[PDB]
């Protein structure tokens, strides 16, 4: 009914369903090997109801890995990179009994990385940063090291391409956060850094943005998800002093300023957690750790769901929750139901003729 | 701070916001820009009580804690002379 | 700029055009003013207009979003109206 | 010629002719609204007649009756949701195109719903149960929301246990005051009338299909539950229940709680209050959401329905096969009629004979 | 770097290093014959070494042992059928490319077969059972044709219960005269040696996998069947059975008669003659046709194998994961070694530490 606690997993979203795969957990007894959760399973969380469904996947199943990068385009999962018991990986997997598909793309694939970020444009997948072995851009060493590559993959024809960078690219880093708002591909934090950059996905030009005023503390293993066309949402992180973070920020894009966001989860800091935006103005974050991750035997991996109410809910959702609340009372009531209204709605959404049987 | 109001004539309801430091006459200018009637022909009420042109909304009894977007306050409107009349909304039955 | 939404029983609700765009149905009907609702009564449409001002005010708001009260006896009417209006 | 495969259709009969309308089939698709299909039960041949006037929308789950060759249709689910409209089609007309008539009945009609049952008593149609929206009026009975419809349907729906009387003389709705424990709200149940007793069996409620047997006394309006001693057919919905005598009800097909299609047949003896399983050659042809009509020659004619779990729509195995259950001895004229037709090479009713000889012409 | 996923491989160890060779994986495909994979059990890091000389063909189901760091390989199934060839690889060599040596042994070798077991007693390798062709020589024991291979294989095959002795001093085959009831012919069984007792558990014979436990006394050559009182692990094949003490055998994984993969672990106490189930974190990672090797630090290291029914080859979930079962208390040096490595940010064996830090570099 609930996935095992994990960190370093991937969570993708279509607006109403959240897909969770991979990650790793700490064993009960202290040891020197991490426990990677089974490759065979994929967890789906319904953001309207709050329950989980576990489906086992066959086919070209990718190995159990952590720190991978995933994206959900038209309910089609794209997975690249990560880290397993043998080392880093540069293999690219896709997933629409569901079957994983290992695709041999044209062009030159990137190196084996993890803790990177990704952007989604019209039909291109744009990956940035990471950490891994030696193979455009730079590659600073720590045998692995931080990354600057901006590899691009076309989903229409499956060709690995790299863009011509105009402007100052950001520094090598991993465990950064990426968010997409229109043609802007945002980066923030990592290494714990505090810089804020965006890349124009249309002109392929790097830009540096310097917010004015109070700014979030430099962090790693944070989450950055857009909550509007002019707002980004940052939660959690990992300071330079390694202090876990339970604070949330809202970054206005047009005004280029930062505002703190209040929430009832100040007692539950998270790092290496995933975050997904719902269609009801919420940010759903799952997994991550509350303790210090560097000490693996003392890690406290979480399987909880934290819901931030960033935007007001729709009138449909508000009314439906009122109906759900007053279920018994309304079952003994009656109300008018104009046919033209009902037919207009059922024209848009359809009506199932087999229900109730 | 803003106050959210419902300006109600017979069957016309206006949804608008204003500052409590704003005056009644300024509100009549807002109604003028919508219903095309100058302030000297309007008459604004607080549920039974005539609103002076010089008084501010906060001085009339409207507070931002009682005129919210989800529950806007009600201001009666009368045009010139006429008796204040607000036809009620439909009933659930 | 303001727009006028007219209920089935003949009530005229004048709201800000930006607030009325909260409903996708109203946005499509205005795109190219008045909008007529022959099947939405005033006790429902007035509640919808209150949601318009509530939704716009608390969108991208730093302060916590308050609860939107919905009386049980109008919940099903409001749900159908909201689905028709797409808001 | 050949009616297309369908489930959720209606089928009514006068004992000689079966009238078939509506239903749906996968490519979802509702069958043409203006087509009325007549199956001649003696000759086994189909005939199509087009209709006009206030033609109802194409629907599944409608409730239909044939009283004195008049077709009455209530409820159902068209492509835009459930309805509570009432239609009449007089099959006694000589028009080349029969005229549907939608009747604006007096009184308060039932809620918009489908998948219900109906009993035909003296000058009244008595409707029970169903699935659909909340009532638009004060109604005697119980409605219960389907909790799965809140997040998966464009508007919440649920089951009811309502009893509604439509008086065919004046076309006026009413509701009787009933006594005793009414059955729980349900849909996809099966109704059968024997005299003043309106039997209802099975159906789905909340979670899990049922196999309870109730009857409403249509004179005293007193509900009664029958607890048969001994074995009973398993709980089901989308089954058919047909009277085959003044003392026997015939049950076929349906859908278990575990979503298994059913091909079992049972007979319930009203006086003895016991079930007996019926042996038949259709063990490999399960049916659900089919229709069943009793013939004047001791046969139950089953049409339409689905062989498998139709809740998966793209894999639904809709059918247009005719399933004939011989539950009473035929008349000697019919038996001798079949004998003569069986030997046409060795020797008007014999002339028409049957249709679709797969052996002829070799 | 990273050995590819495989089933049917061989894995042998000296308590510190695990040697991995052969196996197969789906695209069928046998892994490169010249690759020898060495897994360092202290550091948890893999190393690849290439081989030369009489390199055996790539095979699954071969039988391998490590005696005094010498690798001995018998039997197996390459792409052209079963074999009975015997190979030796001396891991103590300083060659950059180790030289395989195929030994022409004296005496009569066993039949060509795979999926068998072996016990290591004083100067002898004792092989038991397997699946393959009819023997090419007179042999003590029983062979039984697999009836499913007559119409589905290019040549009939079957199971045997043969016992063969390979004396490592002279490389001469022989067969002991045994007493008592030998176990039935079988393949995919598991063998474990404790002193002069060669235990054999499970396997497949005719139809249905088994859970019988036998041991052959390697001094008296007397077969014995152990009937433990109480619960026992379910019947299986393709399981692993590893001694973890002078009195305990460790059993993991396998394949039920109903083709279900297994993730259960059991310990058999030789003196008490009873089984106890072992709690472990790999309940969601069943393995079959895997290998298991005992470590010098009280761990059983499981490698390779398949998570599901690999009899369907295109859907076989072959693995290269390492599964570590802690079955005995570790040494304090190893525990203190892990503690120091666990805190490198707070403070040669500590320097090498482990590999593949998923957290480092953030």
mmCIF file of N, CA and C in Angstrom, chain D residues 57 71 109 123 133 135 148 172 178 194 196 198 219 227 238 244 248 254 270-271 281 284 315 319 329 331 349-350:
data_model
loop_
_atom_site.group_PDB
_atom_site.id
_atom_site.type_symbol
_atom_site.label_atom_id
_atom_site.label_comp_id
_atom_site.label_asym_id
_atom_site.label_seq_id
_atom_site.Cartn_x
_atom_site.Cartn_y
_atom_site.Cartn_z
ATOM 1 N N UNK D 57 -32.662 8.991 -27.775
ATOM 2 C CA UNK D 57 -31.235 8.852 -28.071
ATOM 3 C C UNK D 57 -30.813 7.401 -27.915
ATOM 4 N N UNK D 71 -44.799 -0.730 -26.883
ATOM 5 C CA UNK D 71 -43.469 -0.694 -26.294
ATOM 6 C C UNK D 71 -43.326 0.559 -25.442
ATOM 7 N N UNK D 109 -41.411 12.256 -11.827
ATOM 8 C CA UNK D 109 -40.795 11.036 -12.359
ATOM 9 C C UNK D 109 -39.659 10.570 -11.466
ATOM 10 N N UNK D 123 -52.569 -2.408 -15.072
ATOM 11 C CA UNK D 123 -52.586 -1.039 -15.584
ATOM 12 C C UNK D 123 -51.423 -0.185 -15.097
ATOM 13 N N UNK D 133 -27.809 9.708 -11.110
ATOM 14 C CA UNK D 133 -27.553 10.909 -10.332
ATOM 15 C C UNK D 133 -28.459 10.968 -9.104
ATOM 16 N N UNK D 135 -31.504 12.286 -6.971
ATOM 17 C CA UNK D 135 -32.830 12.717 -7.425
ATOM 18 C C UNK D 135 -32.935 14.233 -7.476
ATOM 19 N N UNK D 148 -16.744 5.467 -5.812
ATOM 20 C CA UNK D 148 -15.781 5.451 -6.906
ATOM 21 C C UNK D 148 -16.093 6.477 -7.988
ATOM 22 N N UNK D 172 -49.321 8.874 -15.279
ATOM 23 C CA UNK D 172 -49.069 9.662 -14.080
ATOM 24 C C UNK D 172 -48.108 8.903 -13.181
ATOM 25 N N UNK D 178 -44.770 1.676 1.172
ATOM 26 C CA UNK D 178 -44.446 0.266 1.309
ATOM 27 C C UNK D 178 -44.151 -0.077 2.763
ATOM 28 N N UNK D 194 -44.711 -12.412 -11.316
ATOM 29 C CA UNK D 194 -45.611 -13.561 -11.312
ATOM 30 C C UNK D 194 -46.842 -13.154 -10.516
ATOM 31 N N UNK D 196 -49.325 -11.092 -8.563
ATOM 32 C CA UNK D 196 -49.190 -9.888 -7.756
ATOM 33 C C UNK D 196 -47.849 -9.809 -7.037
ATOM 34 N N UNK D 198 -43.794 -9.214 -7.336
ATOM 35 C CA UNK D 198 -42.690 -8.728 -8.140
ATOM 36 C C UNK D 198 -41.347 -9.142 -7.575
ATOM 37 N N UNK D 219 -50.117 -5.854 -4.309
ATOM 38 C CA UNK D 219 -51.405 -5.467 -3.747
ATOM 39 C C UNK D 219 -51.258 -4.796 -2.386
ATOM 40 N N UNK D 227 -35.712 -16.661 1.935
ATOM 41 C CA UNK D 227 -34.469 -17.315 2.335
ATOM 42 C C UNK D 227 -34.579 -18.792 1.977
ATOM 43 N N UNK D 238 -26.120 -8.249 -13.674
ATOM 44 C CA UNK D 238 -26.221 -8.341 -15.133
ATOM 45 C C UNK D 238 -26.748 -9.703 -15.579
ATOM 46 N N UNK D 244 -41.201 -18.644 -16.179
ATOM 47 C CA UNK D 244 -41.439 -19.700 -17.150
ATOM 48 C C UNK D 244 -42.679 -20.515 -16.812
ATOM 49 N N UNK D 248 -42.537 -20.866 -11.419
ATOM 50 C CA UNK D 248 -41.112 -21.066 -11.651
ATOM 51 C C UNK D 248 -40.484 -19.845 -12.305
ATOM 52 N N UNK D 254 -24.807 -13.754 -15.953
ATOM 53 C CA UNK D 254 -24.479 -12.771 -14.942
ATOM 54 C C UNK D 254 -22.997 -12.533 -14.737
ATOM 55 N N UNK D 270 -41.362 -21.188 -6.856
ATOM 56 C CA UNK D 270 -41.933 -20.210 -5.934
ATOM 57 C C UNK D 270 -42.591 -20.907 -4.749
ATOM 58 N N UNK D 271 -43.386 -21.947 -5.018
ATOM 59 C CA UNK D 271 -44.094 -22.631 -3.940
ATOM 60 C C UNK D 271 -43.128 -23.393 -3.040
ATOM 61 N N UNK D 281 -26.966 -26.700 -23.236
ATOM 62 C CA UNK D 281 -25.762 -26.840 -24.065
ATOM 63 C C UNK D 281 -24.894 -25.595 -24.168
ATOM 64 N N UNK D 284 -20.309 -23.219 -22.502
ATOM 65 C CA UNK D 284 -19.141 -22.507 -23.002
ATOM 66 C C UNK D 284 -19.487 -21.148 -23.594
ATOM 67 N N UNK D 315 -11.720 -4.957 -25.006
ATOM 68 C CA UNK D 315 -11.672 -6.411 -25.097
ATOM 69 C C UNK D 315 -13.028 -7.061 -24.846
ATOM 70 N N UNK D 319 -21.980 -9.913 -28.400
ATOM 71 C CA UNK D 319 -22.544 -10.991 -29.197
ATOM 72 C C UNK D 319 -23.895 -10.585 -29.770
ATOM 73 N N UNK D 329 -42.323 -28.304 -22.073
ATOM 74 C CA UNK D 329 -42.669 -29.113 -23.246
ATOM 75 C C UNK D 329 -43.405 -28.287 -24.292
ATOM 76 N N UNK D 331 -45.754 -27.531 -27.721
ATOM 77 C CA UNK D 331 -47.015 -28.038 -28.235
ATOM 78 C C UNK D 331 -46.761 -29.076 -29.324
ATOM 79 N N UNK D 349 -47.095 -22.495 -42.561
ATOM 80 C CA UNK D 349 -46.100 -22.611 -41.497
ATOM 81 C C UNK D 349 -44.963 -23.543 -41.896
ATOM 82 N N UNK D 350 -45.282 -24.641 -42.582
ATOM 83 C CA UNK D 350 -44.232 -25.518 -43.091
ATOM 84 C C UNK D 350 -43.470 -24.844 -44.225
#
